[PDB]
Amino acid sequence: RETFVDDILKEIREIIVQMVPREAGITDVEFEGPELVIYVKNPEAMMKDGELIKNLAKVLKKRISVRPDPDILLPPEKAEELIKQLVPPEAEITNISFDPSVGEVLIEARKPGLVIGKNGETLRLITQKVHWAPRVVRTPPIQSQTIYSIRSILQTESKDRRKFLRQVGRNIYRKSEYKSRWIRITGLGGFREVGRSALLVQTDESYVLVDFGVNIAALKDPTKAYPHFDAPEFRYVLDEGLLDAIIITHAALDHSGMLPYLFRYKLFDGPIYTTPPTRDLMTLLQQDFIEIQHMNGVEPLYRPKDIKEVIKHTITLDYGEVRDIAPDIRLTLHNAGHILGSSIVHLHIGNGLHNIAITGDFKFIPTRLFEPAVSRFPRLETLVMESTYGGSNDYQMPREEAEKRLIEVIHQTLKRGGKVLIPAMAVGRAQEIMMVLEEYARVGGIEVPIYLDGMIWEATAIHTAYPEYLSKHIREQIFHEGYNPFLNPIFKSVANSRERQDIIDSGEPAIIIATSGMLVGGPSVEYFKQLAPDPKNSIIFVSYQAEGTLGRQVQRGLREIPIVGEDGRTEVINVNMEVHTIDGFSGAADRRELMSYVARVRPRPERIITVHGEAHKCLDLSSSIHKKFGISTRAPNNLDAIRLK
Amino acid sequence: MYKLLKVKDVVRIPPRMFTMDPKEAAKIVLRETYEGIYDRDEGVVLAILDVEEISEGVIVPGDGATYHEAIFNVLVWEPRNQEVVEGEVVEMMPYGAFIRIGPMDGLVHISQLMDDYVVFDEKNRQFIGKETNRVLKLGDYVRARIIGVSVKSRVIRENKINMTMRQPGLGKFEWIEKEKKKA
Amino acid sequence: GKIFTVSVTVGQETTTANLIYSKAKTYNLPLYAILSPSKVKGYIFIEAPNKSAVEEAIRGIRHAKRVLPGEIPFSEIEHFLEEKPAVSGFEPGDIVELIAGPFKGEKAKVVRVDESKDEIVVELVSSVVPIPVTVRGEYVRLISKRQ
Amino acid sequence: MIGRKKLEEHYITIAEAKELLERRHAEGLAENPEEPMFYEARVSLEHAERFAKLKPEQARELKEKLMGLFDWINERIAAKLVDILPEDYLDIRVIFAKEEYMPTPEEAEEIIKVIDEYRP
Amino acid sequence: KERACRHCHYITTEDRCPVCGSRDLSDDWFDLVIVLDVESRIAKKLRESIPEAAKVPGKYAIRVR
DNA sequence: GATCATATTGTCCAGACAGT
DNA sequence: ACTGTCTGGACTGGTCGGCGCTATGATC
RNA sequence: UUUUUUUUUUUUUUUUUUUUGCGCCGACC
Ligand SMILES: [Zn+2]
Ligand SMILES: [Zn+2]
């Protein structure tokens, strides 16, 4: 297609040289994804204060990234020494990396606030005295394998990443601010159903795909496990390569499971806009899904190299940051409160033409982990909302008495010397349970160790890596105070099977948080097998148990369960332990929460689309909203296109 | 189908059982070997009854144990195609009902229980009919005919059994008596 | 004259043909014509009255190995000179292999064939869901022919 | 394939299996561990006890009179008839339809009239 | 780079076409044909296929794309 | 200045074999 | 049927330690 | 003033525990 990126770049350069003083020495101006990069020979005059950069960003309506000229670059050892001397010793810098190709130094520090500065003046001071553009990322207190691998992949593929970013920036700004003639919303999946979500945003200029996911419940049937690839609009977009970007709401298999499949068969080549916690958690979940599919004997959906390609094609966006991802579409992300890095996708199509907010999975009540979902937007016309708990009789129990019952059950179990086994998801409810247990044990209620097995430790490390995405209480504790709730010594990690055997054989009371809520794999099955005959122990279920799983069999009240032994003979598990079920820790919004979010959203949307739930639940939610507030509501099926404007 | 077979086999008896009775040691070894697995030719191996005859030991190089030719009786249960069985429902599932007919549990599909559009009731784990208004619950005398046998693996639990109840004469004992009342 | 074969290094037939042509022009070799099809790898066709002229022309070049001791009938290389589309000769329903493109080393089934745009639509056989893709005709290679 | 070779095989009814499983349960109880047998043997014993329609001696005598009654039947379907214990024509018809023979109603009535005795 | 004419199928290194003076040249072509004698057999075969080819000895292309 | 296809085709003893 | 000729093959076991050797030319 | 088309209900989770080879040279018994 025809592009006018060169004319836009020339106009931007003319505006810059009109505004920026001549002593700066501007050499090259280019686009790197959704941000503008300016190369100068005198960084001292360019950024003596933040007012000039702020004025340039306000005038150009772009994210300005000032970088020094590659010709004026200090030696890496002298640059490292100068950076270490300039940064205060309170901020413990761990790793410093340099990019010879483009002026940029990556600084890994335990306290990025001191490296950045009170108002960013420390970054300007560093890039002035050292002539190296600084990029600061947080070193987690708990080491994370996924984050280290992602950072190593990004650093080792700098040339490919820069080429991809330049191509994305050229494609995004192919033309200036364009008013779309029409806006179309089509659902390739997740409409009147749970899982395999897929939302396509179509205009006359650009196309946007939102939370491309997969279905695990119907994995046996290919017609229901994956989004509708037979849609004529999706086929036209993929065949012609017109997909501008893909945005993932949050890191779950029903929202990001099908992402590596596109890169496996080279069906996509553009960028992916997720928050860094969402990217890390979705990479971990995709790797676990691939490993599980491999272990089950079925053909894996994709390969780890496809996940690496997804990592290489991912652009990280923070909360509240407005970026241009299309000639007519502006994308910003807001907190959702469901899981770590969960974002509500807000799309600003045109210059005030229309606004779409896709909430996805979200929570509107305050929690121990994350702040409630953002209900305030600069402009809102169409709202897309989940309907997982959209039924009239769907009313989840409040959090405080559920956690009180959990605490009292755990205390009763530990009073008699038993062991508490809590099967849980890899992300979500497990971290909330750990936070509740840490709060209870901080007053001296319990002294027994808490053991995390499987992906719980990795998810905890990822949570520690991004404390700004957590709730206000945890943020205040970590930043204002010196206390980190996740760094409690009670939380212990078991390395191998020998440590698990020692934990099981030990007579001292302990709390074990496994990584399989249904007891279908992982260390949860072994823990249940080795702790079931003991009557002093107890098992607490914090999630719904699907039919046909071992966890549902234990929850229903089966005293004995026949299983296949190691030698090939049937084995009988005597479940003499206590069984408890507390389903009050669900991260999904309640029906009352959904109604409150509809009532308290500002501004009031013109129409509301109910998706991500069962068909009768979605219809009930839409009818209730229409009857209570008078807003027009629709619950379309799959392959349904709605013309918003 | 319960079966009784007389099997002649070579039994390896370790030196730790040298002081015991040869017949008792052979029976213990045979119980450790054959009991608890599925045989492709004979079906589920239930138990080893007794050892009839035992021969003198033979010592082979590389092993100190003695090998004896033993004759023993085996009780086995084998499911065959198109075989009518009588059992009791022990497990209820949304996709079907599991009936205990012996060492293995068969599966009857939701369309297969009766000539009616039966739906599952989750609250009580029962099947409720639409026109016949018949209810199936725990501990019910039922009769079905096997239509599917899987011998893919030697593990009893991994093997699957599928039975039918569409045909006349297959169902609950009360239902059978109701059918016989008309005739 | 007579068609002769010269064995050259694979992937560098055009440069060897150009060097032979330049040498023949400069030194007045009795060479009639040189044909170097792109589909044929490592071999070029030189038209000369006798094989001695070909041997004298190709010597002194590191990349010209030897001349095949035989004469090719013109009917064998007649089809090379004719211009035909790469899409033509392909029917839907068979299995093809994609030599080049983003789908290198992948087997696919032909779905739609159009000779107007010189493009062929294929469906990957290893994909769990059918996703038709448009690829150039010359990029594919016919593995089997069924329907 | 159990063992090296099979000498003889016999089809037994539910009651004989119940007696054998009771003997094996007694033998396992005589053993030091509290578990007499595995899950499948215990389940089979429970099913045979809950479906103990006739005594083992009654099952054997019914089997031998069934063998001496008609010639086209074999041991397997004789044991099947002993276990089922039919009382009318529909059940014997639906269990003989899939067999190799389709007996006329007179011999089915004769079978009913001989197996009517010593029944619960 | 070397580009071939769409009319006479002639490969030239300059914008001007020394055969027909065409301004539309294609940078993608395969099966390079070198013609040294006009009366060559392959030149005659190319003449009946493409009328404008083999008029002047030199480089030639079988197809233009 | 970085990468990519291609990279060549020692005497003596015994058994089998043309020659006369 | 003899007689000189062509061709294939195997070349005593073990042990000690050292000393090299395992890409290159042509675009982009 | 006019021919030759048909029509309807039963398969569940958003996921899991240690340099090979090649050849050369010297040497011991
Ligand atoms: Zn979801
Ligand atoms: Zn021309």
PDB file of C-alpha atoms (C1' of nucleotides) in Angstrom, chain H residues 2-29:
ATOM      1  C1'   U H   2     -46.770 -24.777 -20.459  1.00  0.00           C
ATOM      2  C1'   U H   3     -42.788 -29.837 -18.689  1.00  0.00           C
ATOM      3  C1'   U H   4     -38.662 -32.979 -14.405  1.00  0.00           C
ATOM      4  C1'   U H   5     -35.689 -31.236  -6.668  1.00  0.00           C
ATOM      5  C1'   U H   6     -35.701 -31.086  -1.877  1.00  0.00           C
ATOM      6  C1'   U H   7     -36.099 -29.749   4.490  1.00  0.00           C
ATOM      7  C1'   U H   8     -35.107 -30.061  11.609  1.00  0.00           C
ATOM      8  C1'   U H   9     -32.133 -32.131  19.367  1.00  0.00           C
ATOM      9  C1'   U H  10     -27.080 -35.875  23.844  1.00  0.00           C
ATOM     10  C1'   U H  11     -18.799 -36.325  25.232  1.00  0.00           C
ATOM     11  C1'   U H  12     -16.240 -32.242  30.982  1.00  0.00           C
ATOM     12  C1'   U H  13     -10.419 -28.503  33.027  1.00  0.00           C
ATOM     13  C1'   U H  14      -8.473 -22.414  30.957  1.00  0.00           C
ATOM     14  C1'   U H  15      -3.672 -26.654  32.964  1.00  0.00           C
ATOM     15  C1'   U H  16       0.912 -30.004  36.074  1.00  0.00           C
ATOM     16  C1'   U H  17       6.974 -33.308  39.699  1.00  0.00           C
ATOM     17  C1'   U H  18      31.648 -37.457  31.253  1.00  0.00           C
ATOM     18  C1'   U H  19      37.790 -35.781  23.899  1.00  0.00           C
ATOM     19  C1'   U H  20      35.958 -39.560  19.184  1.00  0.00           C
ATOM     20  C1'   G H  21      38.560 -40.600  14.861  1.00  0.00           C
ATOM     21  C1'   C H  22      43.076 -40.377  11.412  1.00  0.00           C
ATOM     22  C1'   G H  23      48.023 -41.037  10.571  1.00  0.00           C
ATOM     23  C1'   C H  24      53.188 -40.663  12.123  1.00  0.00           C
ATOM     24  C1'   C H  25      57.368 -41.382  15.357  1.00  0.00           C
ATOM     25  C1'   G H  26      60.011 -43.385  19.466  1.00  0.00           C
ATOM     26  C1'   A H  27      60.120 -47.285  23.050  1.00  0.00           C
ATOM     27  C1'   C H  28      59.139 -51.860  26.597  1.00  0.00           C
ATOM     28  C1'   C H  29      58.231 -57.035  27.087  1.00  0.00           C
TER      29        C H  29
END
